[PDB]
Amino acid sequence: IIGGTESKPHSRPYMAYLEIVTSNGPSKFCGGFLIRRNFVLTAAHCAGRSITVTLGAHNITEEEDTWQKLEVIKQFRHPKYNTSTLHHDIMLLKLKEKASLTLAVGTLPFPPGRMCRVAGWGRTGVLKPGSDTLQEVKLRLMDPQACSHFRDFDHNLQLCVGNPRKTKSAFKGDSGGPLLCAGVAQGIVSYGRSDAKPPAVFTRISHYRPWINQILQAN
Ligand SMILES: CC(=O)NC(C)(C)Cc1c([C@@H](C2=C(O)[C@](C)(c3ccc(C)cc3)C2=O)c2ccccc2)[nH]c2cc(C)ccc12
Ligand SMILES: [Zn+2]
């Protein structure tokens, strides 16, 4: 998160920190959010050989009783995900066991112009490491023409988030996190520019409600 503030500890108890293993490199990182006691929503490009989910965190460098470190049994990447266009950048993670409900850990249930909020542990600048603490920022929903320069952007599948006149933005490390508009989840962080100039591209959740319901009902 660029240009944001430190979240109040444990104020977003659905938030998930993902550590992802690839075969021929060190760990990489993404965000996500708990939608059922044994399911986490995130981005398809965050898939790997194996993934560990940490719930209940604020400062990710200091172990505490609120932490739940949970095993992933299976990854459900969207079957139409395209690595060229980045269309359909969405994935469900099934947890080996159901999470415990505490003050610090719980689910987020399901229900241009206005303001929304996004949170994550990602980089705080182009040449700056990821944040030790959970950060968040308020951003403007933009009309789709603001994202024309992303040649594979589509208004039906995606949202355009962040006023180009400000520095505030999601960035690398924040992919898979939720965008909340008046307390309701409307988007998932996907991608943007290498130089971090806003706006960025988010997945539009409403389009995928049939697919999400299908996975949850059969697993
Ligand atoms: C290739 C490339 O450099 N793409 C651009 C867009 C320039 C940079 C970019 C990415 C990028 C990316 C990673 O690296 C990382 C950390 C990751 C994590 C875990 C895994 C397993 C694989 C990768 C991740 O996310 C990415 C995005 C999409 C696809 C692939 C990689 N995400 C953004 C989010 C915003 C807000 C802004 C810009 C970007
Ligand atoms: Zn704590």
PDB file of N, CA and C in Angstrom, residues 27-77:
ATOM      1  N   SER A  27      10.283 -17.824  -1.522  1.00  0.00           N
ATOM      2  CA  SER A  27       8.901 -17.449  -1.234  1.00  0.00           C
ATOM      3  C   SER A  27       8.512 -16.112  -1.876  1.00  0.00           C
ATOM      4  N   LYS A  28       7.254 -16.034  -2.354  1.00  0.00           N
ATOM      5  CA  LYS A  28       6.591 -14.787  -2.738  1.00  0.00           C
ATOM      6  C   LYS A  28       5.310 -14.604  -1.909  1.00  0.00           C
ATOM      7  N   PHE A  29       4.702 -13.398  -1.934  1.00  0.00           N
ATOM      8  CA  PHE A  29       3.633 -13.044  -0.994  1.00  0.00           C
ATOM      9  C   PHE A  29       2.443 -12.365  -1.680  1.00  0.00           C
ATOM     10  N   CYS A  30       1.232 -12.623  -1.148  1.00  0.00           N
ATOM     11  CA  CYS A  30      -0.013 -11.987  -1.568  1.00  0.00           C
ATOM     12  C   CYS A  30      -0.952 -11.811  -0.368  1.00  0.00           C
ATOM     13  N   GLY A  31      -2.048 -11.068  -0.576  1.00  0.00           N
ATOM     14  CA  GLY A  31      -3.153 -11.004   0.368  1.00  0.00           C
ATOM     15  C   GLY A  31      -4.301 -11.919  -0.052  1.00  0.00           C
ATOM     16  N   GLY A  32      -5.351 -11.973   0.790  1.00  0.00           N
ATOM     17  CA  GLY A  32      -6.585 -12.723   0.565  1.00  0.00           C
ATOM     18  C   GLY A  32      -7.610 -12.420   1.666  1.00  0.00           C
ATOM     19  N   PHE A  33      -8.810 -13.036   1.612  1.00  0.00           N
ATOM     20  CA  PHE A  33      -9.811 -12.833   2.658  1.00  0.00           C
ATOM     21  C   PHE A  33     -10.688 -14.078   2.859  1.00  0.00           C
ATOM     22  N   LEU A  34     -11.044 -14.340   4.127  1.00  0.00           N
ATOM     23  CA  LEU A  34     -11.795 -15.524   4.541  1.00  0.00           C
ATOM     24  C   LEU A  34     -13.285 -15.312   4.272  1.00  0.00           C
ATOM     25  N   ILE A  35     -13.906 -16.162   3.428  1.00  0.00           N
ATOM     26  CA  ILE A  35     -15.323 -16.011   3.102  1.00  0.00           C
ATOM     27  C   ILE A  35     -16.168 -17.123   3.724  1.00  0.00           C
ATOM     28  N   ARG A  36     -15.531 -18.246   4.093  1.00  0.00           N
ATOM     29  CA  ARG A  36     -16.136 -19.296   4.903  1.00  0.00           C
ATOM     30  C   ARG A  36     -15.038 -19.819   5.828  1.00  0.00           C
ATOM     31  N   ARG A  37     -15.406 -20.559   6.878  1.00  0.00           N
ATOM     32  CA  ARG A  37     -14.424 -20.987   7.867  1.00  0.00           C
ATOM     33  C   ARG A  37     -13.307 -21.819   7.223  1.00  0.00           C
ATOM     34  N   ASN A  38     -13.569 -22.463   6.069  1.00  0.00           N
ATOM     35  CA  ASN A  38     -12.537 -23.227   5.372  1.00  0.00           C
ATOM     36  C   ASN A  38     -12.304 -22.774   3.924  1.00  0.00           C
ATOM     37  N   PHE A  39     -12.605 -21.508   3.573  1.00  0.00           N
ATOM     38  CA  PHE A  39     -12.325 -20.995   2.232  1.00  0.00           C
ATOM     39  C   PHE A  39     -11.813 -19.548   2.245  1.00  0.00           C
ATOM     40  N   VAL A  40     -10.752 -19.315   1.444  1.00  0.00           N
ATOM     41  CA  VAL A  40     -10.131 -18.011   1.223  1.00  0.00           C
ATOM     42  C   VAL A  40     -10.162 -17.646  -0.265  1.00  0.00           C
ATOM     43  N   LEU A  41     -10.599 -16.411  -0.561  1.00  0.00           N
ATOM     44  CA  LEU A  41     -10.590 -15.841  -1.904  1.00  0.00           C
ATOM     45  C   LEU A  41      -9.325 -14.997  -2.102  1.00  0.00           C
ATOM     46  N   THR A  42      -8.713 -15.092  -3.298  1.00  0.00           N
ATOM     47  CA  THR A  42      -7.489 -14.371  -3.658  1.00  0.00           C
ATOM     48  C   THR A  42      -7.375 -14.309  -5.191  1.00  0.00           C
ATOM     49  N   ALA A  43      -6.190 -13.947  -5.716  1.00  0.00           N
ATOM     50  CA  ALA A  43      -5.974 -13.827  -7.159  1.00  0.00           C
ATOM     51  C   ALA A  43      -5.343 -15.098  -7.739  1.00  0.00           C
ATOM     52  N   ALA A  44      -5.720 -15.447  -8.985  1.00  0.00           N
ATOM     53  CA  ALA A  44      -5.216 -16.628  -9.676  1.00  0.00           C
ATOM     54  C   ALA A  44      -3.702 -16.591  -9.893  1.00  0.00           C
ATOM     55  N   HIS A  45      -3.118 -15.401 -10.078  1.00  0.00           N
ATOM     56  CA  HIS A  45      -1.694 -15.294 -10.347  1.00  0.00           C
ATOM     57  C   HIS A  45      -0.857 -15.568  -9.091  1.00  0.00           C
ATOM     58  N   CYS A  46      -1.516 -15.704  -7.924  1.00  0.00           N
ATOM     59  CA  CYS A  46      -0.843 -16.045  -6.675  1.00  0.00           C
ATOM     60  C   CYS A  46      -0.742 -17.565  -6.465  1.00  0.00           C
ATOM     61  N   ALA A  47      -1.108 -18.390  -7.466  1.00  0.00           N
ATOM     62  CA  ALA A  47      -1.025 -19.843  -7.343  1.00  0.00           C
ATOM     63  C   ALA A  47       0.435 -20.293  -7.292  1.00  0.00           C
ATOM     64  N   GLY A  48       0.678 -21.477  -6.702  1.00  0.00           N
ATOM     65  CA  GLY A  48       2.015 -22.065  -6.639  1.00  0.00           C
ATOM     66  C   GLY A  48       1.984 -23.565  -6.312  1.00  0.00           C
ATOM     67  N   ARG A  49       3.155 -24.135  -5.999  1.00  0.00           N
ATOM     68  CA  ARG A  49       3.271 -25.543  -5.633  1.00  0.00           C
ATOM     69  C   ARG A  49       2.627 -25.812  -4.266  1.00  0.00           C
ATOM     70  N   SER A  50       2.836 -24.914  -3.291  1.00  0.00           N
ATOM     71  CA  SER A  50       2.156 -25.000  -2.001  1.00  0.00           C
ATOM     72  C   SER A  50       2.003 -23.609  -1.379  1.00  0.00           C
ATOM     73  N   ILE A  51       0.985 -23.446  -0.509  1.00  0.00           N
ATOM     74  CA  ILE A  51       0.645 -22.165   0.102  1.00  0.00           C
ATOM     75  C   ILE A  51       0.294 -22.354   1.583  1.00  0.00           C
ATOM     76  N   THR A  52       0.786 -21.430   2.424  1.00  0.00           N
ATOM     77  CA  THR A  52       0.424 -21.338   3.835  1.00  0.00           C
ATOM     78  C   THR A  52      -0.341 -20.037   4.090  1.00  0.00           C
ATOM     79  N   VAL A  53      -1.435 -20.130   4.867  1.00  0.00           N
ATOM     80  CA  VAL A  53      -2.305 -19.005   5.190  1.00  0.00           C
ATOM     81  C   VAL A  53      -2.141 -18.644   6.668  1.00  0.00           C
ATOM     82  N   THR A  54      -1.859 -17.362   6.973  1.00  0.00           N
ATOM     83  CA  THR A  54      -1.849 -16.893   8.356  1.00  0.00           C
ATOM     84  C   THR A  54      -3.027 -15.935   8.564  1.00  0.00           C
ATOM     85  N   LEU A  55      -3.950 -16.323   9.461  1.00  0.00           N
ATOM     86  CA  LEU A  55      -5.044 -15.474   9.917  1.00  0.00           C
ATOM     87  C   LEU A  55      -4.676 -14.858  11.271  1.00  0.00           C
ATOM     88  N   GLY A  56      -5.314 -13.727  11.605  1.00  0.00           N
ATOM     89  CA  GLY A  56      -5.200 -13.101  12.921  1.00  0.00           C
ATOM     90  C   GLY A  56      -3.964 -12.209  13.101  1.00  0.00           C
ATOM     91  N   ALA A  57      -3.310 -11.787  12.003  1.00  0.00           N
ATOM     92  CA  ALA A  57      -2.050 -11.061  12.109  1.00  0.00           C
ATOM     93  C   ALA A  57      -2.257  -9.550  12.024  1.00  0.00           C
ATOM     94  N   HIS A  58      -1.318  -8.813  12.645  1.00  0.00           N
ATOM     95  CA  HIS A  58      -1.141  -7.380  12.426  1.00  0.00           C
ATOM     96  C   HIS A  58       0.307  -7.119  12.012  1.00  0.00           C
ATOM     97  N   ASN A  59       1.251  -7.193  12.971  1.00  0.00           N
ATOM     98  CA  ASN A  59       2.679  -7.150  12.679  1.00  0.00           C
ATOM     99  C   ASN A  59       3.164  -8.570  12.409  1.00  0.00           C
ATOM    100  N   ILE A  60       3.510  -8.848  11.144  1.00  0.00           N
ATOM    101  CA  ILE A  60       3.763 -10.201  10.678  1.00  0.00           C
ATOM    102  C   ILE A  60       5.138 -10.707  11.139  1.00  0.00           C
ATOM    103  N   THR A  61       5.941  -9.878  11.834  1.00  0.00           N
ATOM    104  CA  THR A  61       7.253 -10.304  12.311  1.00  0.00           C
ATOM    105  C   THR A  61       7.201 -10.785  13.762  1.00  0.00           C
ATOM    106  N   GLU A  62       6.062 -10.615  14.456  1.00  0.00           N
ATOM    107  CA  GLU A  62       5.966 -10.940  15.879  1.00  0.00           C
ATOM    108  C   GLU A  62       4.821 -11.922  16.147  1.00  0.00           C
ATOM    109  N   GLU A  63       5.186 -13.169  16.494  1.00  0.00           N
ATOM    110  CA  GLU A  63       4.254 -14.248  16.804  1.00  0.00           C
ATOM    111  C   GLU A  63       3.358 -13.868  17.983  1.00  0.00           C
ATOM    112  N   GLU A  64       2.065 -14.234  17.918  1.00  0.00           N
ATOM    113  CA  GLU A  64       1.130 -13.938  19.003  1.00  0.00           C
ATOM    114  C   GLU A  64      -0.033 -14.936  19.019  1.00  0.00           C
ATOM    115  N   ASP A  65      -0.766 -14.982  20.143  1.00  0.00           N
ATOM    116  CA  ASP A  65      -1.817 -15.973  20.360  1.00  0.00           C
ATOM    117  C   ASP A  65      -2.952 -15.842  19.333  1.00  0.00           C
ATOM    118  N   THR A  66      -3.178 -14.641  18.774  1.00  0.00           N
ATOM    119  CA  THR A  66      -4.222 -14.444  17.769  1.00  0.00           C
ATOM    120  C   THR A  66      -3.906 -15.210  16.477  1.00  0.00           C
ATOM    121  N   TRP A  67      -2.620 -15.521  16.204  1.00  0.00           N
ATOM    122  CA  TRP A  67      -2.242 -16.180  14.955  1.00  0.00           C
ATOM    123  C   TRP A  67      -2.907 -17.550  14.819  1.00  0.00           C
ATOM    124  N   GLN A  68      -3.428 -17.819  13.611  1.00  0.00           N
ATOM    125  CA  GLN A  68      -3.775 -19.158  13.157  1.00  0.00           C
ATOM    126  C   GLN A  68      -3.040 -19.444  11.842  1.00  0.00           C
ATOM    127  N   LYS A  69      -2.045 -20.339  11.900  1.00  0.00           N
ATOM    128  CA  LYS A  69      -1.290 -20.752  10.724  1.00  0.00           C
ATOM    129  C   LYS A  69      -1.923 -22.011  10.131  1.00  0.00           C
ATOM    130  N   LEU A  70      -2.529 -21.903   8.940  1.00  0.00           N
ATOM    131  CA  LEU A  70      -3.408 -22.959   8.455  1.00  0.00           C
ATOM    132  C   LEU A  70      -2.941 -23.552   7.122  1.00  0.00           C
ATOM    133  N   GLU A  71      -3.058 -24.885   7.024  1.00  0.00           N
ATOM    134  CA  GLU A  71      -2.700 -25.659   5.844  1.00  0.00           C
ATOM    135  C   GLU A  71      -3.775 -25.523   4.763  1.00  0.00           C
ATOM    136  N   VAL A  72      -3.336 -25.424   3.495  1.00  0.00           N
ATOM    137  CA  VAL A  72      -4.212 -25.441   2.324  1.00  0.00           C
ATOM    138  C   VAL A  72      -4.229 -26.859   1.740  1.00  0.00           C
ATOM    139  N   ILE A  73      -5.418 -27.449   1.537  1.00  0.00           N
ATOM    140  CA  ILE A  73      -5.521 -28.785   0.952  1.00  0.00           C
ATOM    141  C   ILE A  73      -5.549 -28.732  -0.582  1.00  0.00           C
ATOM    142  N   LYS A  74      -6.243 -27.751  -1.187  1.00  0.00           N
ATOM    143  CA  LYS A  74      -6.381 -27.691  -2.638  1.00  0.00           C
ATOM    144  C   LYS A  74      -6.600 -26.253  -3.121  1.00  0.00           C
ATOM    145  N   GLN A  75      -6.058 -25.944  -4.317  1.00  0.00           N
ATOM    146  CA  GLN A  75      -6.204 -24.655  -4.994  1.00  0.00           C
ATOM    147  C   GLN A  75      -7.165 -24.778  -6.186  1.00  0.00           C
ATOM    148  N   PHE A  76      -8.162 -23.879  -6.259  1.00  0.00           N
ATOM    149  CA  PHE A  76      -9.164 -23.855  -7.320  1.00  0.00           C
ATOM    150  C   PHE A  76      -9.020 -22.580  -8.153  1.00  0.00           C
ATOM    151  N   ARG A  77      -8.124 -22.618  -9.142  1.00  0.00           N
ATOM    152  CA  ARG A  77      -7.887 -21.500 -10.040  1.00  0.00           C
ATOM    153  C   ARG A  77      -9.021 -21.439 -11.063  1.00  0.00           C
TER     154      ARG A  77
END
